[PDB]
PDB file of all heavy atoms in Angstrom:
ATOM      1  N   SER A  66     115.093 161.015 140.160  1.00 51.26           N
ATOM      2  CA  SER A  66     115.900 162.026 139.497  1.00 51.26           C
ATOM      3  C   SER A  66     115.051 162.820 138.514  1.00 51.26           C
ATOM      4  O   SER A  66     113.927 162.462 138.197  1.00 51.26           O
ATOM      5  CB  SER A  66     117.058 161.415 138.815  1.00 51.26           C
ATOM      6  OG  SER A  66     116.631 160.641 137.711  1.00 51.26           O
ATOM      7  N   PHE A  67     115.650 163.961 138.053  1.00 51.57           N
ATOM      8  CA  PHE A  67     114.929 164.774 137.115  1.00 51.57           C
ATOM      9  C   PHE A  67     115.889 165.540 136.223  1.00 51.57           C
ATOM     10  O   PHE A  67     117.027 165.859 136.579  1.00 51.57           O
ATOM     11  CB  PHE A  67     113.849 165.682 137.754  1.00 51.57           C
ATOM     12  CG  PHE A  67     114.535 166.470 138.865  1.00 51.57           C
ATOM     13  CD1 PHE A  67     115.022 167.708 138.581  1.00 51.57           C
ATOM     14  CD2 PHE A  67     114.491 166.005 140.134  1.00 51.57           C
ATOM     15  CE1 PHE A  67     115.552 168.484 139.553  1.00 51.57           C
ATOM     16  CE2 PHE A  67     115.171 166.750 141.142  1.00 51.57           C
ATOM     17  CZ  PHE A  67     115.621 168.007 140.809  1.00 51.57           C
ATOM     18  N   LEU A  68     115.388 165.777 135.026  1.00 51.63           N
ATOM     19  CA  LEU A  68     116.141 166.374 133.924  1.00 51.63           C
ATOM     20  C   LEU A  68     115.567 167.744 133.498  1.00 51.63           C
ATOM     21  O   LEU A  68     116.153 168.459 132.678  1.00 51.63           O
ATOM     22  CB  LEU A  68     116.149 165.499 132.664  1.00 51.63           C
ATOM     23  CG  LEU A  68     117.332 164.657 132.527  1.00 51.63           C
ATOM     24  CD1 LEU A  68     117.033 163.710 131.382  1.00 51.63           C
ATOM     25  CD2 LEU A  68     118.615 165.459 132.281  1.00 51.63           C
ATOM     26  N   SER A  69     114.491 168.128 134.101  1.00 49.00           N
ATOM     27  CA  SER A  69     113.817 169.395 133.723  1.00 49.00           C
ATOM     28  C   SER A  69     112.792 169.755 134.786  1.00 49.00           C
ATOM     29  O   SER A  69     112.569 168.922 135.710  1.00 49.00           O
ATOM     30  CB  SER A  69     112.895 169.291 132.376  1.00 49.00           C
ATOM     31  OG  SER A  69     111.991 168.203 132.471  1.00 49.00           O
ATOM     32  N   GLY A  70     112.234 170.943 134.741  1.00 48.07           N
ATOM     33  CA  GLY A  70     111.140 171.287 135.533  1.00 48.07           C
ATOM     34  C   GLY A  70     111.464 171.780 136.939  1.00 48.07           C
ATOM     35  O   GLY A  70     112.661 172.027 137.251  1.00 48.07           O
ATOM     36  N   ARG A  71     110.436 172.012 137.717  1.00 43.36           N
ATOM     37  CA  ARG A  71     110.466 172.529 139.059  1.00 43.36           C
ATOM     38  C   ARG A  71     110.055 171.458 140.045  1.00 43.36           C
ATOM     39  O   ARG A  71     109.084 170.761 139.877  1.00 43.36           O
ATOM     40  CB  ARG A  71     109.542 173.749 139.174  1.00 43.36           C
ATOM     41  CG  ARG A  71     110.038 174.913 138.342  1.00 43.36           C
ATOM     42  CD  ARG A  71     109.047 176.028 138.185  1.00 43.36           C
ATOM     43  NE  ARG A  71     108.034 175.585 137.224  1.00 43.36           N
ATOM     44  CZ  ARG A  71     106.941 176.294 136.993  1.00 43.36           C
ATOM     45  NH1 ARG A  71     106.703 177.410 137.622  1.00 43.36           N
ATOM     46  NH2 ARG A  71     106.027 175.749 136.183  1.00 43.36           N
ATOM     47  N   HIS A  72     110.851 171.301 141.098  1.00 41.11           N
ATOM     48  CA  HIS A  72     110.660 170.215 142.065  1.00 41.11           C
ATOM     49  C   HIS A  72     110.942 170.709 143.484  1.00 41.11           C
ATOM     50  O   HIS A  72     111.927 171.336 143.703  1.00 41.11           O
ATOM     51  CB  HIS A  72     111.610 169.067 141.778  1.00 41.11           C
ATOM     52  CG  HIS A  72     111.461 168.613 140.339  1.00 41.11           C
ATOM     53  ND1 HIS A  72     110.693 167.579 139.964  1.00 41.11           N
ATOM     54  CD2 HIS A  72     112.045 169.079 139.275  1.00 41.11           C
ATOM     55  CE1 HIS A  72     110.743 167.512 138.601  1.00 41.11           C
ATOM     56  NE2 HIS A  72     111.569 168.408 138.227  1.00 41.11           N
ATOM     57  N   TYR A  73     110.079 170.341 144.394  1.00 40.17           N
ATOM     58  CA  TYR A  73     110.187 170.762 145.758  1.00 40.17           C
ATOM     59  C   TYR A  73     110.045 169.579 146.708  1.00 40.17           C
ATOM     60  O   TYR A  73     109.124 168.747 146.495  1.00 40.17           O
ATOM     61  CB  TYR A  73     109.107 171.807 146.099  1.00 40.17           C
ATOM     62  CG  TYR A  73     109.120 172.264 147.541  1.00 40.17           C
ATOM     63  CD1 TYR A  73     110.023 173.248 147.958  1.00 40.17           C
ATOM     64  CD2 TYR A  73     108.271 171.696 148.520  1.00 40.17           C
ATOM     65  CE1 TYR A  73     110.050 173.656 149.244  1.00 40.17           C
ATOM     66  CE2 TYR A  73     108.369 172.114 149.793  1.00 40.17           C
ATOM     67  CZ  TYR A  73     109.225 173.130 150.189  1.00 40.17           C
ATOM     68  OH  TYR A  73     109.211 173.560 151.495  1.00 40.17           O
ATOM     69  N   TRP A  74     110.813 169.530 147.795  1.00 42.67           N
ATOM     70  CA  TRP A  74     110.607 168.573 148.862  1.00 42.67           C
ATOM     71  C   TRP A  74     111.025 169.207 150.200  1.00 42.67           C
ATOM     72  O   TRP A  74     111.744 170.202 150.203  1.00 42.67           O
ATOM     73  CB  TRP A  74     111.255 167.214 148.577  1.00 42.67           C
ATOM     74  CG  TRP A  74     112.737 167.242 148.492  1.00 42.67           C
ATOM     75  CD1 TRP A  74     113.654 166.990 149.460  1.00 42.67           C
ATOM     76  CD2 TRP A  74     113.510 167.592 147.317  1.00 42.67           C
ATOM     77  NE1 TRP A  74     114.939 167.160 148.953  1.00 42.67           N
ATOM     78  CE2 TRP A  74     114.853 167.575 147.641  1.00 42.67           C
ATOM     79  CE3 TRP A  74     113.143 167.988 145.999  1.00 42.67           C
ATOM     80  CZ2 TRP A  74     115.846 167.846 146.737  1.00 42.67           C
ATOM     81  CZ3 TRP A  74     114.141 168.256 145.111  1.00 42.67           C
ATOM     82  CH2 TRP A  74     115.507 168.214 145.485  1.00 42.67           C
ATOM     83  N   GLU A  75     110.530 168.600 151.273  1.00 38.12           N
ATOM     84  CA  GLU A  75     110.701 169.100 152.604  1.00 38.12           C
ATOM     85  C   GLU A  75     111.175 168.001 153.501  1.00 38.12           C
ATOM     86  O   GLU A  75     110.768 166.833 153.413  1.00 38.12           O
ATOM     87  CB  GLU A  75     109.380 169.664 153.157  1.00 38.12           C
ATOM     88  CG  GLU A  75     108.950 171.040 152.630  1.00 38.12           C
ATOM     89  CD  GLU A  75     107.802 171.569 153.430  1.00 38.12           C
ATOM     90  OE1 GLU A  75     107.239 171.121 154.546  1.00 38.12           O
ATOM     91  OE2 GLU A  75     107.533 172.539 152.969  1.00 38.12           O
ATOM     92  N   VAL A  76     112.130 168.377 154.450  1.00 36.80           N
ATOM     93  CA  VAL A  76     112.749 167.447 155.343  1.00 36.80           C
ATOM     94  C   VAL A  76     112.709 168.010 156.777  1.00 36.80           C
ATOM     95  O   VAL A  76     113.107 169.103 157.043  1.00 36.80           O
ATOM     96  CB  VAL A  76     114.197 167.176 154.952  1.00 36.80           C
ATOM     97  CG1 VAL A  76     114.867 166.111 155.823  1.00 36.80           C
ATOM     98  CG2 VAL A  76     114.290 166.822 153.485  1.00 36.80           C
ATOM     99  N   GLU A  77     112.234 167.175 157.687  1.00 37.38           N
ATOM    100  CA  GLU A  77     112.332 167.432 159.109  1.00 37.38           C
ATOM    101  C   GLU A  77     113.788 167.207 159.599  1.00 37.38           C
ATOM    102  O   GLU A  77     114.286 166.079 159.427  1.00 37.38           O
ATOM    103  CB  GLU A  77     111.406 166.547 159.921  1.00 37.38           C
ATOM    104  CG  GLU A  77     109.911 166.750 159.727  1.00 37.38           C
ATOM    105  CD  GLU A  77     109.016 165.928 160.622  1.00 37.38           C
ATOM    106  OE1 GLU A  77     109.533 165.178 161.429  1.00 37.38           O
ATOM    107  OE2 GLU A  77     107.754 166.024 160.403  1.00 37.38           O
ATOM    108  N   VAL A  78     114.373 168.258 160.125  1.00 36.95           N
ATOM    109  CA  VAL A  78     115.691 168.222 160.719  1.00 36.95           C
ATOM    110  C   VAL A  78     115.597 168.322 162.231  1.00 36.95           C
ATOM    111  O   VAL A  78     116.548 167.946 162.979  1.00 36.95           O
ATOM    112  CB  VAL A  78     116.643 169.277 160.157  1.00 36.95           C
ATOM    113  CG1 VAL A  78     116.828 169.111 158.691  1.00 36.95           C
ATOM    114  CG2 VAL A  78     116.173 170.709 160.434  1.00 36.95           C
ATOM    115  N   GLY A  79     114.461 168.859 162.764  1.00 40.59           N
ATOM    116  CA  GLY A  79     114.277 168.920 164.188  1.00 40.59           C
ATOM    117  C   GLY A  79     115.426 169.611 164.908  1.00 40.59           C
ATOM    118  O   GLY A  79     115.948 170.668 164.494  1.00 40.59           O
ATOM    119  N   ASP A  80     115.762 169.006 166.058  1.00 41.05           N
ATOM    120  CA  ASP A  80     116.764 169.552 166.979  1.00 41.05           C
ATOM    121  C   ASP A  80     118.140 168.929 166.784  1.00 41.05           C
ATOM    122  O   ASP A  80     119.056 169.028 167.558  1.00 41.05           O
ATOM    123  CB  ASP A  80     116.321 169.319 168.406  1.00 41.05           C
ATOM    124  CG  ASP A  80     114.977 169.999 168.764  1.00 41.05           C
ATOM    125  OD1 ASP A  80     114.559 170.936 168.051  1.00 41.05           O
ATOM    126  OD2 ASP A  80     114.347 169.569 169.785  1.00 41.05           O
ATOM    127  N   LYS A  81     118.327 168.377 165.580  1.00 40.13           N
ATOM    128  CA  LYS A  81     119.632 167.843 165.166  1.00 40.13           C
ATOM    129  C   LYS A  81     120.717 168.924 165.216  1.00 40.13           C
ATOM    130  O   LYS A  81     120.421 170.085 165.009  1.00 40.13           O
ATOM    131  CB  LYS A  81     119.512 167.181 163.795  1.00 40.13           C
ATOM    132  CG  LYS A  81     118.780 165.858 163.854  1.00 40.13           C
ATOM    133  CD  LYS A  81     118.619 165.218 162.515  1.00 40.13           C
ATOM    134  CE  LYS A  81     119.911 164.730 161.853  1.00 40.13           C
ATOM    135  NZ  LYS A  81     120.721 163.857 162.738  1.00 40.13           N
ATOM    136  N   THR A  82     121.983 168.474 165.356  1.00 38.91           N
ATOM    137  CA  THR A  82     123.105 169.425 165.417  1.00 38.91           C
ATOM    138  C   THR A  82     123.938 169.392 164.133  1.00 38.91           C
ATOM    139  O   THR A  82     124.796 170.280 163.966  1.00 38.91           O
ATOM    140  CB  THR A  82     123.996 169.149 166.590  1.00 38.91           C
ATOM    141  OG1 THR A  82     124.558 167.839 166.469  1.00 38.91           O
ATOM    142  CG2 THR A  82     123.288 169.213 167.956  1.00 38.91           C
ATOM    143  N   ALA A  83     123.662 168.463 163.185  1.00 37.26           N
ATOM    144  CA  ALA A  83     124.410 168.453 161.957  1.00 37.26           C
ATOM    145  C   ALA A  83     123.655 167.702 160.927  1.00 37.26           C
ATOM    146  O   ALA A  83     122.967 166.725 161.234  1.00 37.26           O
ATOM    147  CB  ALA A  83     125.806 167.899 162.103  1.00 37.26           C
ATOM    148  N   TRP A  84     123.769 168.095 159.652  1.00 38.21           N
ATOM    149  CA  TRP A  84     123.090 167.447 158.530  1.00 38.21           C
ATOM    150  C   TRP A  84     123.525 168.138 157.214  1.00 38.21           C
ATOM    151  O   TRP A  84     124.178 169.201 157.269  1.00 38.21           O
ATOM    152  CB  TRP A  84     121.549 167.456 158.670  1.00 38.21           C
ATOM    153  CG  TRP A  84     120.971 168.779 159.066  1.00 38.21           C
ATOM    154  CD1 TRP A  84     120.459 169.027 160.294  1.00 38.21           C
ATOM    155  CD2 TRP A  84     120.735 169.977 158.278  1.00 38.21           C
ATOM    156  NE1 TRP A  84     119.957 170.324 160.317  1.00 38.21           N
ATOM    157  CE2 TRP A  84     120.053 170.880 159.106  1.00 38.21           C
ATOM    158  CE3 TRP A  84     120.959 170.342 156.975  1.00 38.21           C
ATOM    159  CZ2 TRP A  84     119.742 172.171 158.690  1.00 38.21           C
ATOM    160  CZ3 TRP A  84     120.650 171.554 156.515  1.00 38.21           C
ATOM    161  CH2 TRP A  84     119.966 172.455 157.346  1.00 38.21           C
ATOM    162  N   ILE A  85     123.269 167.442 156.116  1.00 44.15           N
ATOM    163  CA  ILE A  85     123.452 167.969 154.810  1.00 44.15           C
ATOM    164  C   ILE A  85     122.194 167.775 154.026  1.00 44.15           C
ATOM    165  O   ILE A  85     121.624 166.660 154.018  1.00 44.15           O
ATOM    166  CB  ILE A  85     124.649 167.266 154.077  1.00 44.15           C
ATOM    167  CG1 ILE A  85     125.917 167.307 154.897  1.00 44.15           C
ATOM    168  CG2 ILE A  85     124.836 167.845 152.662  1.00 44.15           C
ATOM    169  CD1 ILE A  85     127.138 166.577 154.315  1.00 44.15           C
ATOM    170  N   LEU A  86     121.757 168.780 153.254  1.00 44.29           N
ATOM    171  CA  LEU A  86     120.577 168.682 152.354  1.00 44.29           C
ATOM    172  C   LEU A  86     120.866 169.433 151.097  1.00 44.29           C
ATOM    173  O   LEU A  86     121.525 170.420 151.088  1.00 44.29           O
ATOM    174  CB  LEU A  86     119.362 169.276 153.025  1.00 44.29           C
ATOM    175  CG  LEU A  86     118.837 168.553 154.277  1.00 44.29           C
ATOM    176  CD1 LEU A  86     117.751 169.381 154.928  1.00 44.29           C
ATOM    177  CD2 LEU A  86     118.304 167.207 153.866  1.00 44.29           C
ATOM    178  N   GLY A  87     120.302 168.940 150.018  1.00 42.25           N
ATOM    179  CA  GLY A  87     120.279 169.641 148.757  1.00 42.25           C
ATOM    180  C   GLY A  87     120.062 168.674 147.609  1.00 42.25           C
ATOM    181  O   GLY A  87     119.255 167.693 147.671  1.00 42.25           O
ATOM    182  N   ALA A  88     120.770 168.890 146.487  1.00 42.63           N
ATOM    183  CA  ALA A  88     120.696 168.066 145.309  1.00 42.63           C
ATOM    184  C   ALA A  88     122.091 167.889 144.756  1.00 42.63           C
ATOM    185  O   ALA A  88     122.997 168.664 144.972  1.00 42.63           O
ATOM    186  CB  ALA A  88     119.711 168.683 144.307  1.00 42.63           C
ATOM    187  N   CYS A  89     122.204 166.865 143.880  1.00 42.04           N
ATOM    188  CA  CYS A  89     123.461 166.629 143.192  1.00 42.04           C
ATOM    189  C   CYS A  89     123.202 166.031 141.826  1.00 42.04           C
ATOM    190  O   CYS A  89     122.111 165.546 141.530  1.00 42.04           O
ATOM    191  CB  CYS A  89     124.336 165.731 144.054  1.00 42.04           C
ATOM    192  SG  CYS A  89     123.656 164.026 144.298  1.00 42.04           S
ATOM    193  N   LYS A  90     124.269 166.032 140.992  1.00 45.50           N
ATOM    194  CA  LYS A  90     124.226 165.314 139.746  1.00 45.50           C
ATOM    195  C   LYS A  90     124.162 163.798 140.034  1.00 45.50           C
ATOM    196  O   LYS A  90     124.745 163.301 140.964  1.00 45.50           O
ATOM    197  CB  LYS A  90     125.477 165.555 138.937  1.00 45.50           C
ATOM    198  CG  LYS A  90     125.679 166.983 138.528  1.00 45.50           C
ATOM    199  CD  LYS A  90     126.959 167.262 137.793  1.00 45.50           C
ATOM    200  CE  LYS A  90     126.967 166.648 136.438  1.00 45.50           C
ATOM    201  NZ  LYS A  90     128.205 166.984 135.742  1.00 45.50           N
ATOM    202  N   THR A  91     123.412 163.085 139.196  1.00 48.73           N
ATOM    203  CA  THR A  91     123.404 161.643 139.363  1.00 48.73           C
ATOM    204  C   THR A  91     124.733 160.934 139.104  1.00 48.73           C
ATOM    205  O   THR A  91     124.891 159.805 139.548  1.00 48.73           O
ATOM    206  CB  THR A  91     122.319 161.040 138.494  1.00 48.73           C
ATOM    207  OG1 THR A  91     122.501 161.359 137.107  1.00 48.73           O
ATOM    208  CG2 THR A  91     120.921 161.405 138.967  1.00 48.73           C
ATOM    209  N   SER A  92     125.627 161.586 138.361  1.00 49.34           N
ATOM    210  CA  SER A  92     126.907 161.037 138.029  1.00 49.34           C
ATOM    211  C   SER A  92     128.000 161.311 139.062  1.00 49.34           C
ATOM    212  O   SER A  92     129.202 161.032 138.819  1.00 49.34           O
ATOM    213  CB  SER A  92     127.300 161.587 136.708  1.00 49.34           C
ATOM    214  OG  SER A  92     127.311 163.011 136.703  1.00 49.34           O
ATOM    215  N   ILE A  93     127.691 161.839 140.253  1.00 47.47           N
ATOM    216  CA  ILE A  93     128.784 162.031 141.237  1.00 47.47           C
ATOM    217  C   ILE A  93     129.472 160.693 141.568  1.00 47.47           C
ATOM    218  O   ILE A  93     128.820 159.647 141.585  1.00 47.47           O
ATOM    219  CB  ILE A  93     128.280 162.715 142.526  1.00 47.47           C
ATOM    220  CG1 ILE A  93     127.124 161.869 143.221  1.00 47.47           C
ATOM    221  CG2 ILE A  93     127.822 164.177 142.314  1.00 47.47           C
ATOM    222  CD1 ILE A  93     126.706 162.266 144.608  1.00 47.47           C
ATOM    223  N   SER A  94     130.777 160.787 141.837  1.00 46.51           N
ATOM    224  CA  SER A  94     131.535 159.625 142.301  1.00 46.51           C
ATOM    225  C   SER A  94     131.061 159.307 143.713  1.00 46.51           C
ATOM    226  O   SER A  94     130.757 160.184 144.511  1.00 46.51           O
ATOM    227  CB  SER A  94     133.008 159.962 142.309  1.00 46.51           C
ATOM    228  OG  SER A  94     133.755 158.905 142.882  1.00 46.51           O
ATOM    229  N   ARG A  95     131.061 158.019 144.024  1.00 46.98           N
ATOM    230  CA  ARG A  95     130.613 157.551 145.305  1.00 46.98           C
ATOM    231  C   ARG A  95     131.789 157.196 146.256  1.00 46.98           C
ATOM    232  O   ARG A  95     131.663 157.148 147.461  1.00 46.98           O
ATOM    233  CB  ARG A  95     129.561 156.407 145.131  1.00 46.98           C
ATOM    234  CG  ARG A  95     128.224 156.972 144.598  1.00 46.98           C
ATOM    235  CD  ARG A  95     127.007 156.013 144.766  1.00 46.98           C
ATOM    236  NE  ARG A  95     125.869 156.375 143.899  1.00 46.98           N
ATOM    237  CZ  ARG A  95     126.062 157.386 143.112  1.00 46.98           C
ATOM    238  NH1 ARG A  95     127.146 158.026 143.404  1.00 46.98           N
ATOM    239  NH2 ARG A  95     125.197 157.760 142.199  1.00 46.98           N
ATOM    240  N   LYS A  96     132.969 156.935 145.688  1.00 47.06           N
ATOM    241  CA  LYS A  96     134.071 156.381 146.425  1.00 47.06           C
ATOM    242  C   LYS A  96     135.070 157.504 146.629  1.00 47.06           C
ATOM    243  O   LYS A  96     135.476 158.203 145.767  1.00 47.06           O
ATOM    244  CB  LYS A  96     134.617 155.155 145.733  1.00 47.06           C
ATOM    245  CG  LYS A  96     133.698 153.927 145.557  1.00 47.06           C
ATOM    246  CD  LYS A  96     133.076 153.307 146.847  1.00 47.06           C
ATOM    247  CE  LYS A  96     132.225 152.056 146.508  1.00 47.06           C
ATOM    248  NZ  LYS A  96     131.556 151.543 147.739  1.00 47.06           N
ATOM    249  N   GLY A  97     135.485 157.617 147.942  1.00 46.54           N
ATOM    250  CA  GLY A  97     136.508 158.581 148.296  1.00 46.54           C
ATOM    251  C   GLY A  97     135.950 159.796 148.981  1.00 46.54           C
ATOM    252  O   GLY A  97     134.742 159.936 149.303  1.00 46.54           O
ATOM    253  N   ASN A  98     136.823 160.810 149.137  1.00 41.58           N
ATOM    254  CA  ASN A  98     136.390 162.085 149.656  1.00 41.58           C
ATOM    255  C   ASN A  98     136.538 163.068 148.513  1.00 41.58           C
ATOM    256  O   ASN A  98     137.461 163.002 147.754  1.00 41.58           O
ATOM    257  CB  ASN A  98     137.106 162.486 150.951  1.00 41.58           C
ATOM    258  CG  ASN A  98     136.460 161.844 152.133  1.00 41.58           C
ATOM    259  OD1 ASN A  98     135.243 162.044 152.343  1.00 41.58           O
ATOM    260  ND2 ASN A  98     137.197 161.064 152.902  1.00 41.58           N
ATOM    261  N   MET A  99     135.520 163.909 148.360  1.00 42.49           N
ATOM    262  CA  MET A  99     135.528 164.997 147.402  1.00 42.49           C
ATOM    263  C   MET A  99     134.763 166.134 148.044  1.00 42.49           C
ATOM    264  O   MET A  99     133.916 165.913 148.901  1.00 42.49           O
ATOM    265  CB  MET A  99     134.830 164.578 146.092  1.00 42.49           C
ATOM    266  CG  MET A  99     135.099 165.516 144.921  1.00 42.49           C
ATOM    267  SD  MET A  99     134.861 164.707 143.334  1.00 42.49           S
ATOM    268  CE  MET A  99     136.067 163.397 143.435  1.00 42.49           C
ATOM    269  N   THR A 100     135.179 167.355 147.708  1.00 42.82           N
ATOM    270  CA  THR A 100     134.556 168.535 148.204  1.00 42.82           C
ATOM    271  C   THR A 100     133.158 168.554 147.681  1.00 42.82           C
ATOM    272  O   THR A 100     132.913 168.363 146.496  1.00 42.82           O
ATOM    273  CB  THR A 100     135.382 169.736 147.762  1.00 42.82           C
ATOM    274  OG1 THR A 100     136.665 169.560 148.391  1.00 42.82           O
ATOM    275  CG2 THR A 100     134.818 171.018 148.297  1.00 42.82           C
ATOM    276  N   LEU A 101     132.164 168.971 148.526  1.00 46.35           N
ATOM    277  CA  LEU A 101     130.768 168.979 148.139  1.00 46.35           C
ATOM    278  C   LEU A 101     130.368 170.268 147.503  1.00 46.35           C
ATOM    279  O   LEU A 101     129.549 171.038 148.075  1.00 46.35           O
ATOM    280  CB  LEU A 101     129.866 168.671 149.339  1.00 46.35           C
ATOM    281  CG  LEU A 101     130.144 167.396 150.093  1.00 46.35           C
ATOM    282  CD1 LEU A 101     129.119 167.219 151.195  1.00 46.35           C
ATOM    283  CD2 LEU A 101     130.207 166.195 149.195  1.00 46.35           C
ATOM    284  N   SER A 102     130.910 170.560 146.333  1.00 45.64           N
ATOM    285  CA  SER A 102     130.862 171.899 145.740  1.00 45.64           C
ATOM    286  C   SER A 102     130.082 171.855 144.437  1.00 45.64           C
ATOM    287  O   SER A 102     129.949 170.789 143.815  1.00 45.64           O
ATOM    288  CB  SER A 102     132.276 172.364 145.351  1.00 45.64           C
ATOM    289  OG  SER A 102     132.807 171.555 144.310  1.00 45.64           O
ATOM    290  N   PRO A 103     129.556 173.005 143.971  1.00 44.96           N
ATOM    291  CA  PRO A 103     128.898 173.076 142.671  1.00 44.96           C
ATOM    292  C   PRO A 103     129.782 172.559 141.577  1.00 44.96           C
ATOM    293  O   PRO A 103     129.303 171.813 140.697  1.00 44.96           O
ATOM    294  CB  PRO A 103     128.526 174.567 142.602  1.00 44.96           C
ATOM    295  CG  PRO A 103     128.292 174.918 143.993  1.00 44.96           C
ATOM    296  CD  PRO A 103     129.376 174.245 144.748  1.00 44.96           C
ATOM    297  N   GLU A 104     131.062 172.866 141.563  1.00 48.33           N
ATOM    298  CA  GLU A 104     131.924 172.397 140.481  1.00 48.33           C
ATOM    299  C   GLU A 104     131.958 170.882 140.453  1.00 48.33           C
ATOM    300  O   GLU A 104     132.053 170.302 139.376  1.00 48.33           O
ATOM    301  CB  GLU A 104     133.282 173.056 140.646  1.00 48.33           C
ATOM    302  CG  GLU A 104     134.275 172.641 139.556  1.00 48.33           C
ATOM    303  CD  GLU A 104     135.504 173.542 139.585  1.00 48.33           C
ATOM    304  OE1 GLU A 104     135.426 174.792 139.611  1.00 48.33           O
ATOM    305  OE2 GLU A 104     136.536 172.900 139.607  1.00 48.33           O
ATOM    306  N   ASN A 105     131.870 170.207 141.612  1.00 54.75           N
ATOM    307  CA  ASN A 105     131.916 168.781 141.707  1.00 54.75           C
ATOM    308  C   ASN A 105     130.491 168.133 141.623  1.00 54.75           C
ATOM    309  O   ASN A 105     130.369 166.924 141.792  1.00 54.75           O
ATOM    310  CB  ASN A 105     132.560 168.298 142.995  1.00 54.75           C
ATOM    311  CG  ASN A 105     134.103 168.602 143.042  1.00 54.75           C
ATOM    312  OD1 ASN A 105     134.649 168.706 144.130  1.00 54.75           O
ATOM    313  ND2 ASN A 105     134.659 168.693 141.886  1.00 54.75           N
ATOM    314  N   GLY A 106     129.446 168.920 141.346  1.00 56.17           N
ATOM    315  CA  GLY A 106     128.128 168.417 141.093  1.00 56.17           C
ATOM    316  C   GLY A 106     127.251 168.359 142.342  1.00 56.17           C
ATOM    317  O   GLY A 106     126.294 167.553 142.335  1.00 56.17           O
ATOM    318  N   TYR A 107     127.505 169.144 143.374  1.00 56.58           N
ATOM    319  CA  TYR A 107     126.746 169.219 144.587  1.00 56.58           C
ATOM    320  C   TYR A 107     126.246 170.627 144.849  1.00 56.58           C
ATOM    321  O   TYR A 107     127.053 171.555 144.778  1.00 56.58           O
ATOM    322  CB  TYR A 107     127.528 168.797 145.832  1.00 56.58           C
ATOM    323  CG  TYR A 107     128.101 167.384 145.782  1.00 56.58           C
ATOM    324  CD1 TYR A 107     129.330 167.133 145.185  1.00 56.58           C
ATOM    325  CD2 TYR A 107     127.391 166.369 146.340  1.00 56.58           C
ATOM    326  CE1 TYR A 107     129.839 165.840 145.226  1.00 56.58           C
ATOM    327  CE2 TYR A 107     127.920 165.066 146.400  1.00 56.58           C
ATOM    328  CZ  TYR A 107     129.166 164.843 145.831  1.00 56.58           C
ATOM    329  OH  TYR A 107     129.620 163.524 145.896  1.00 56.58           O
ATOM    330  N   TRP A 108     124.992 170.748 145.220  1.00 54.75           N
ATOM    331  CA  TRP A 108     124.454 172.032 145.649  1.00 54.75           C
ATOM    332  C   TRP A 108     123.735 171.777 147.002  1.00 54.75           C
ATOM    333  O   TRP A 108     122.569 171.308 147.038  1.00 54.75           O
ATOM    334  CB  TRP A 108     123.436 172.619 144.598  1.00 54.75           C
ATOM    335  CG  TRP A 108     124.108 172.845 143.305  1.00 54.75           C
ATOM    336  CD1 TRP A 108     124.635 174.031 142.879  1.00 54.75           C
ATOM    337  CD2 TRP A 108     124.323 171.902 142.216  1.00 54.75           C
ATOM    338  NE1 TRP A 108     125.189 173.822 141.637  1.00 54.75           N
ATOM    339  CE2 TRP A 108     125.012 172.549 141.208  1.00 54.75           C
ATOM    340  CE3 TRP A 108     123.975 170.534 142.045  1.00 54.75           C
ATOM    341  CZ2 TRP A 108     125.403 171.897 139.996  1.00 54.75           C
ATOM    342  CZ3 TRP A 108     124.332 169.945 140.843  1.00 54.75           C
ATOM    343  CH2 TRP A 108     125.014 170.638 139.871  1.00 54.75           C
TER     344      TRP A 108
END
């Protein structure tokens, strides 16, 4: 995790047909369904 600064990483997705990538707050809820939105701590 990180609290400051600039950070880069790269992921091979290949010929996959579905995936999710990005960053989130460390405090996101883990249980249930929630929309994966900036307001909910997901980018």
